[PDB]
Amino acid sequence: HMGVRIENNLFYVESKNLSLIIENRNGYLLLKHLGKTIKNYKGSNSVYERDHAFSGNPTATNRTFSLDTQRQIFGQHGLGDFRKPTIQVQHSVTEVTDFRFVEAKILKGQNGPQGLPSPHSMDDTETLVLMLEDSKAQLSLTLYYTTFNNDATIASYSKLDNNSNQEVVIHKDFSFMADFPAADYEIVTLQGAYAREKTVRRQQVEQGIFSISSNRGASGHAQTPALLLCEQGVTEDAGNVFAIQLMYSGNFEAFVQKNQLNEVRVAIGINPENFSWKLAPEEYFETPVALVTHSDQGLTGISHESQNFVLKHIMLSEFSKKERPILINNWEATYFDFQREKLLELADEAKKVGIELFVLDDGWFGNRFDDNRALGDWVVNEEKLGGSLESLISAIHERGLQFGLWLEPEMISVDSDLYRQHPDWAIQVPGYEHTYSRNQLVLNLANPQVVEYLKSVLDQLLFYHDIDYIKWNMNRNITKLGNGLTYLETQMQSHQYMLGLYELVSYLTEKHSHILFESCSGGGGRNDLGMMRYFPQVWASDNTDAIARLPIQYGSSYLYPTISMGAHVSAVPNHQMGRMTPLETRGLVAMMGNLGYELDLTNLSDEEKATIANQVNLYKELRPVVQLGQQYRLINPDTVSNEAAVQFNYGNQTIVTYVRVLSVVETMETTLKLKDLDEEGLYKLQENGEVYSGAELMYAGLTVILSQGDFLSRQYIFRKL
Amino acid sequence: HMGVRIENNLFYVESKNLSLIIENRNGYLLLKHLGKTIKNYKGSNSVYERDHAFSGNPTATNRTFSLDTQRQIFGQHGLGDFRKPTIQVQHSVTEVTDFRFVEAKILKGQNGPQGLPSPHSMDDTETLVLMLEDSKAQLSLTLYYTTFNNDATIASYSKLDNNSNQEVVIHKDFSFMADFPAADYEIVTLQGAYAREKTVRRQQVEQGIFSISSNRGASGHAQTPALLLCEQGVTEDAGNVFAIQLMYSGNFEAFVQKNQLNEVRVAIGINPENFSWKLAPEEYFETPVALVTHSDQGLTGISHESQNFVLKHIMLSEFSKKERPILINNWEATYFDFQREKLLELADEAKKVGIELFVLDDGWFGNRFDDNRALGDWVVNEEKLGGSLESLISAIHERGLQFGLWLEPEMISVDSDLYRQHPDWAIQVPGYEHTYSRNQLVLNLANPQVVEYLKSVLDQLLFYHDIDYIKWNMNRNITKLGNGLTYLETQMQSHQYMLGLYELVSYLTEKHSHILFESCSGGGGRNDLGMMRYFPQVWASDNTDAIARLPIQYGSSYLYPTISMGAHVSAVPNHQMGRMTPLETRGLVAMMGNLGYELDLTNLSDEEKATIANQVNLYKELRPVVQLGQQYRLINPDTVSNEAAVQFNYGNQTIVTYVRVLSVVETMETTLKLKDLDEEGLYKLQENGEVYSGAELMYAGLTVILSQGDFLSRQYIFRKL
Amino acid sequence: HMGVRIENNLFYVESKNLSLIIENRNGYLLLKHLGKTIKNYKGSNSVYERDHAFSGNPTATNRTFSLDTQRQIFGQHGLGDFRKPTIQVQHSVTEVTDFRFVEAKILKGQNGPQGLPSPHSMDDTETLVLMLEDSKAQLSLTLYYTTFNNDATIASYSKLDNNSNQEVVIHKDFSFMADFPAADYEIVTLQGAYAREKTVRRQQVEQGIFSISSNRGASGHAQTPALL
Amino acid sequence: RNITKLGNGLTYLETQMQSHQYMLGLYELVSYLTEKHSHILFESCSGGGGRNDLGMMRYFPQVWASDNTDAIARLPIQYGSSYLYPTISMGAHVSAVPNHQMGRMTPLETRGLVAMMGNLGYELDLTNLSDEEKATIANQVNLYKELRPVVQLGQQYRLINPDTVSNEAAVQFNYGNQTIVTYVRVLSVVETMETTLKLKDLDEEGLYKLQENGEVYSGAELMYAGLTVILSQGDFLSRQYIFRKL
Numbered sequence A, B: 001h002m003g004v005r006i007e008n009n010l011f012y013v014e015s016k017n018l019s020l021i022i023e024n025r026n027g028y029l030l031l032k033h034l035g036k037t038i039k040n041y042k043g044s045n046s047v048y049e050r051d052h053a054f055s056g057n058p059t060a061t062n063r064t065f066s067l068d069t070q071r072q073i074f075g076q077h078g079l080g081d082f083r084k085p086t087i088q089v090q091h092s093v094t095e096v097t098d099f100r101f102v103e104a105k106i107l108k109g110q111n112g113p114q115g116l117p118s119p120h121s122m123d124d125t126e127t128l129v130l131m132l133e134d135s136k137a138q139l140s141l142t143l144y145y146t147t148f149n150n151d152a153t154i155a156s157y158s159k160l161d162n163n164s165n166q167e168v169v170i171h172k173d174f175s176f177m178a179d180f181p182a183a184d185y186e187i188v189t190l191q192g193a194y195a196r197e198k199t200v201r202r203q204q205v206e207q208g209i210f211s212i213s214s215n216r217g218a219s220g221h222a223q224t225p226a227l228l229l230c231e232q233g234v235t236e237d238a239g240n241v242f243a244i245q246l247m248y249s250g251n252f253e254a255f256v257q258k259n260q261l262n263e264v265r266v267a268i269g270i271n272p273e274n275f276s277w278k279l280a281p282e283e284y285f286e287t288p289v290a291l292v293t294h295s296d297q298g299l300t301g302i303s304h305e306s307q308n309f310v311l312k313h314i315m316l317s318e319f320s321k322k323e324r325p326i327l328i329n330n331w332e333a334t335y336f337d338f339q340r341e342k343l344l345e346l347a348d349e350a351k352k353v354g355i356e357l358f359v360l361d362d363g364w365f366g367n368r369f370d371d372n373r374a375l376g377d378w379v380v381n382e383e384k385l386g387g388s389l390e391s392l393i394s395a396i397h398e399r400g401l402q403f404g405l406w407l408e409p410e411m412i413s414v415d416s417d418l419y420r421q422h423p424d425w426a427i428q429v430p431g432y433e434h435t436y437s438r439n440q441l442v443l444n445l446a447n448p449q450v451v452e453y454l455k456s457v458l459d460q461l462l463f464y465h466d467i468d469y470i471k472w473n474m475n476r477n478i479t480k481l482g483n484g485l486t487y488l489e490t491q492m493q494s495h496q497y498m499l500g501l502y503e504l505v506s507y508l509t510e511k512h513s514h515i516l517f518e519s520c521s522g523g524g525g526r527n528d529l530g531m532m533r534y535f536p537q538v539w540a541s542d543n544t545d546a547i548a549r550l551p552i553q554y555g556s557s558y559l560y561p562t563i564s565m566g567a568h569v570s571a572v573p574n575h576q577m578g579r580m581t582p583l584e585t586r587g588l589v590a591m592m593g594n595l596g597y598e599l600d601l602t603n604l605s606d607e608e609k610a611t612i613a614n615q616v617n618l619y620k621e622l623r624p625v626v627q628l629g630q631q632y633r634l635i636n637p638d639t640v641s642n643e644a645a646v647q648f649n650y651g652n653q654t655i656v657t658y659v660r661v662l663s664v665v666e667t668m669e670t671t672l673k674l675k676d677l678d679e680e681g682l683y684k685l686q687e688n689g690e691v692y693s694g695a696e697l698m699y700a701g702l703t704v705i706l707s708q709g710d711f712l713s714r715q716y717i718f719r720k721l
Numbered sequence C: 001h002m003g004v005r006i007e008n009n010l011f012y013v014e015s016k017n018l019s020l021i022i023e024n025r026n027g028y029l030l031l032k033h034l035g036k037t038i039k040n041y042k043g044s045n046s047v048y049e050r051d052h053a054f055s056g057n058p059t060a061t062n063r064t065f066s067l068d069t070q071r072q073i074f075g076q077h078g079l080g081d082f083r084k085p086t087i088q089v090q091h092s093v094t095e096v097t098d099f100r101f102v103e104a105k106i107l108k109g110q111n112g113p114q115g116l117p118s119p120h121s122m123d124d125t126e127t128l129v130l131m132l133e134d135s136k137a138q139l140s141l142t143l144y145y146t147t148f149n150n151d152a153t154i155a156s157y158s159k160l161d162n163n164s165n166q167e168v169v170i171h172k173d174f175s176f177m178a179d180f181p182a183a184d185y186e187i188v189t190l191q192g193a194y195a196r197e198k199t200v201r202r203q204q205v206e207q208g209i210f211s212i213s214s215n216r217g218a219s220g221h222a223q224t225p226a227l228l
Numbered sequence D: 001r002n003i004t005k006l007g008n009g010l011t012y013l014e015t016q017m018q019s020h021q022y023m024l025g026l027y028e029l030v031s032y033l034t035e036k037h038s039h040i041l042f043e044s045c046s047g048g049g050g051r052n053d054l055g056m057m058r059y060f061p062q063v064w065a066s067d068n069t070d071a072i073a074r075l076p077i078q079y080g081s082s083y084l085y086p087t088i089s090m091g092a093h094v095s096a097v098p099n100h101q102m103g104r105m106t107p108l109e110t111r112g113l114v115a116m117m118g119n120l121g122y123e124l125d126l127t128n129l130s131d132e133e134k135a136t137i138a139n140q141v142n143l144y145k146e147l148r149p150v151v152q153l154g155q156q157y158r159l160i161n162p163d164t165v166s167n168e169a170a171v172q173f174n175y176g177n178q179t180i181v182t183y184v185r186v187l188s189v190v191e192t193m194e195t196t197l198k199l200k201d202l203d204e205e206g207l208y209k210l211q212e213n214g215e216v217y218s219g220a221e222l223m224y225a226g227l228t229v230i231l232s233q234g235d236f237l238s239r240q241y242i243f244r245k246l
Ligand SMILES: OC[C@H]1O[C@H](OC[C@H]2O[C@H](O[C@]3(CO)O[C@H](CO)[C@@H](O)[C@@H]3O)[C@H](O)[C@@H](O)[C@@H]2O)[C@H](O)[C@@H](O)[C@H]1O
Pocket: A331, A335, A361, A362, A371, A406, A438, A473, A475, A520, A521, A522, A523, A539, A542, A543, A575, A576, C052, C053, C054
């Protein structure tokens, strides 16, 4: 039985196979258990209350009760707990608060912070509402924990109300925190860099503080809003994992602190850096939604739990189970140098190879002949497109292709009519020169006039044109914060920017819900669950190299479903890596993602065209298995591995893709075992027609054979009889 | 379905959840699969046949078939395979053989090598019989693989027949071998030293050869006949483990070889060192029984599989499920300095504290007043015992105690009547001085007159005395091999010694099957599955320190059931470690084994006597849980751990023992989670009366509380309601 | 030879067997070398200036110069460097500063911050004085680096002057910072607890941020002000 | 204790300044008193080592390294406390048994040798000791009066580090013609070969006379062959080697 229960001084938040059990101890909230379901909890793992030196107390005479030593669900500074705090509010002459539990209620169904991306499909949910007050400061803090009946995830956020008659300032306000008992732990995060997105990192939890954070105003290429606290020795197949993640796309922090007693705190939320929030009397602030997800089935267990929750409760219902079109994108194909003739020729060739959607990338607007001007000027360049966009779209439609279009709405070039008309719309500091990045500036989406302008321009574009797909790029990070009328308003503008972005994209995606929107940020610069609430796919990386894509895809699909993960077959030598790879390998690697194409089809040989047509035919078959099926990592492409292998199961279909990076010699063949088959099931391998029992494939495995050479790949295709 | 199947050129050896599948390829036997059950095996994991440089071939024209690269079940040298061989026979001018498969048959039921310890309770077994011949050398080699219907174990041994009319000499003859596919592996072994027996060692498999071996003529304190080849990253709870073990108590070797292709060979058997075996025409040689055991449930999985197989098919049925008596042994209590008065006083005190069995240790025979004489002279010292042994036994019986007695039959002192009468009965080399060890010599049990003498003397002792228990010690290793009439006979004497030992102990244990025989060798110097066939318990270590016993018990029960594992509460400061430990801890540590007592009860305070009486009462309750229940390691006492914890489940009873070695300060309490309970089960903790669900105990766990101090312990006792 | 030297656009801070060599590049201060003595430094280990994606620039047309990628001796936020900053001052509506090197001087002998514990026996020392200004905010930041003739140690601190006619607020102001070239590193710290003081901890440097800190108003039992 | 409840400012900003201003106040106070009374030896303390840093060591030339006075628990504490700070700073006291923090019996000899790797004092009720324990202490004091310059003024060399896995600690001090080495074993071991302990930073050709046996060893022998370290059976045993360079 799942949902929320209040039983004496215990609160039980009960999702599928995951419980959070909280005790009200005289107004203090104690984390008793987070993990697998326990009913009738007695307290076997209660903290032993001891006099711990230099750990102080709320009363004079009791040295054994200390907030420095109790396991909690939110952290304050100044009351004796010296671990990193997750709520800190300035009021009058202090930033000490003492929030005490006052009242609990339970909600059913849809529930979340206003103006921030939050779970959908919430009919079968309950939400625990923990109302806390600081009587002296006349502030309220309300904690929300929501259950899910179909996933081992709990969602959380808080609301802070100013009930005083002075201005108060929020300095810290995270979305989730948990104190875990002293034990050995490891952590997994996804970091990396541009063209190396979502690099999977694993390390031992050590005394002190480890953190990942973005202060770039976007979540960023080099860190994802996720932190996995793992049982020592976790594998792909076994051990406990708790994943904490944030549905937010701006500045964030995730941290793990191991204190002086070996206790462990984890939290995620809005980054304290670049953040303060003024609340006038009666005003309130709600945090973005955090998620805590659990598996006892190792890292593959947590992947599945996280992917399922995303598919069911984050990604738009309209698209979460809808096969995505195989596209052609002209970007690497032509860059800025194109016109109508070239576009339709490319469309002609895309149609012949069975591609479904044609995306017109950067360069169609203003005087955008390079990347040094025109952002902000969303006016069709009818000269370059050889007539109206409407006439181009009709042409593409008449050739049997859906039509897609690139935008970068959050940006403005100095050399643009927009900047000439409104220079104050850029993020900037009075009396400081701009900082430039790809020779462009960022629009101040904390300015409601900016948001209004973009809603108008884009609504016009989408209503007057028959566009099937949008690619929403964002190609620099935020510098020179100084647009506020006060310092405090500047401190608010980075979060207000996000609120502005979310108002904009929720509006357009809702008002044009037939359109498939793909998010982008020089690839995976903002590939997080805030964006995935509105954009059901994402351009995973500007790196389109088949081999460099291996670790990128590993990380990009670690917590997010494969269906989200844009992957394109591109030209050789590869533009980022300067590398030759087989077209077969480029194909098989992209087919582990959401397949498209990004190269000049008009310049290929007859043979290369035929190969591509075969790849398209193959993927039309594999697409449901890849996009709708269950993913199993078999060999992980890490820093030392020479191999990658990923399996997908979907009903009677099982496929396995294998890639070897460097050629080897006098090295015995790898044995590759499949996972999650029926032992007694019979599996017919397409290439040789041989029928193998599931037990054979899982416990004996495939001897993997390759010729001599770098970057070779193969695929095994099975049908269960 | 289990047993043996022959299907075209495949042989299937099918135990419970474990299969060995062998292919006959033109007379060569190939290991196709060893692991979880596969029916209808097709060969997904077949070796890819390739020209591998410097890997030669049985025919000129086919460079892709090589015994250097095929996975096999026995290894020869000289035919192109350069991995370590497991059969090597000298005949005429060569030690090249080429055994080729000729015929297979299947046996049902009881089956094993003559004169060597082998599995019992074999009604539900089948044995694959693979008959091989070398036509040129006129030798036969027959391989036996036996299934078990109730355990994931396969047993193996071989028989080598000389069908030629010349003498041949066996140089190498192992009992089991398997070639495993290139992959990452770790190995676990039990090594250590005297007073540090069965130290659990784990390491990475590396290119080259790793081995453990004894050349001491006994398996030895410092290595056990076991090797566990483990999946990379195996835990207590998860991953594949293959344990290979040997039912032999003499010289052995276990090895893992990683060859030039990354392939892995493992084998166990009689050590080539100190071994050669002459076969005259018509003569044959059978190897000791090896076992291969499998679990996919980590190291606890393999512990359970190994323990269960030992309990059901090795340890004597008469004792395998029989609670063992709590004993007093006088050895540490008095050493050699005792007489009748002291013995009966000790018996009186043992009776008052509820002890069940009184063991008279070394010093009762010949003129054994120290350890410098009298071994070999098994004549009762009626002066020291204050009358006949019969009169002592009656006295002990009348006090309500069973009676036990120490022997060391395999040994002879220079200063003895035995040595004065038969100096040639000692193992020795003509013209070399003795090598001494504890100032004694080893009897040559390869001499049938020695075996006859010991059968006679011991049969007399056991038939004319009402003895309930025997402790069979053996206190040195074998030096100065030179008793043969030829070099070859000397090379045979170490194995013949074992054959002599096994003839002796199988005879006496069978003829006096009511007696509980406990094996001993300065503690755990010969604690192997050869001995455990006849001796259902073993003195695990001369080290009786509660704390030093932690790693010893960990290893001693790793593959062997707890019931086998002698453990005694002894005096402080401890005689081996020079350490004070709490009597409570000595008690709780010994109670994780087969409990007895070894200290001078007559010299204890009234309080210490009362404590012991309480310990005895407690263990009378715990005994079935400990001896008959299922063992779960919760915290392992290794080189870095500061803790040990072991759980036992038996029906409605669950107990957990926890020990902390060094006192800690400002360190959060350990959280100890129980295993293998019913989630919905209700578990009443004896000490506080609180009722916890199995889910709570398994997923939240116990906060473990201790006072300040070294070597503290506690026990949790649960009853399932 | 030890002490401080100014040579064209290089500053050399030279203690016994330890040098800090700083380059003034158009007002930006670059850490060229920290480690064993080098005279006549040419720049073998200079940063290669490359267009690094999402690493922005103080001018529109030069994408290869970025404070996100240059090795520095103090860190600001808002000018394109996104690494953790060590100076951050609120003034008017912003906490963006842009301190630019203006002038260097050299002191001899005793020198240190007023009211804070600082080295003694300083007769054989020299101190590099790097005067930085943010003309817009009308703030000065002055960096001090002091040599020792008998020890491989350099001492550092800074002075921040408000030359504006409004109140300003310092939010961050660390005492030393160094950017080290990509390589494998380990760190040693002294942590522990009450009754377990100064426990020696060693670990691998990993992507992300590791920190020890006290917010107890004393340095504390569980962390020492040291990082190796 | 540590600081809680910050709110003494007339404004929020002044509260935000009070923690640093507190330190400025502390330093004004201690610089004043230590300067005005510079003959006095001031030892800093904070429930032991709660504030053992180089700010304090500017004014307080020694520090109470830890409230933990257990000889064995002191091993990792001293390792860290002298890692970057000189031994002379590092207060260490021989205390009573069972130890008040650890609840542990340790030999008085070991308590002595461990404290003598620091700045030695005593912290137990001397009036309640046996005649024998008093005599031992008098011998320890006599010994340290000799060792004090070597320990406090000499060069420290860690030979075996007491970490989480080590069962041993060993620290050497060189001072002119004097070299001492202290060795401690935590848990008793059995059937384990003796440790070989090599000394550091000696003259290869120098001749080193070991006090306990009178044997003369070259520096090369002590550095490259090393001492076989012998102990009886038992926990928390220690010994000291004392050398004079001839
Ligand atoms: O402008 C369209 C483009 O926007 C995003 O990528 C921006 C990316 O462009 C630049 O690099 C090149 C072309 O000069 O583009 C590819 C990467 O796609 C590179 O191999 C090549 O250097 C800039 O140099 C980068 O700073 C910048 O990140 C979007 O992600 C692309 O898909 C495309 O739509």
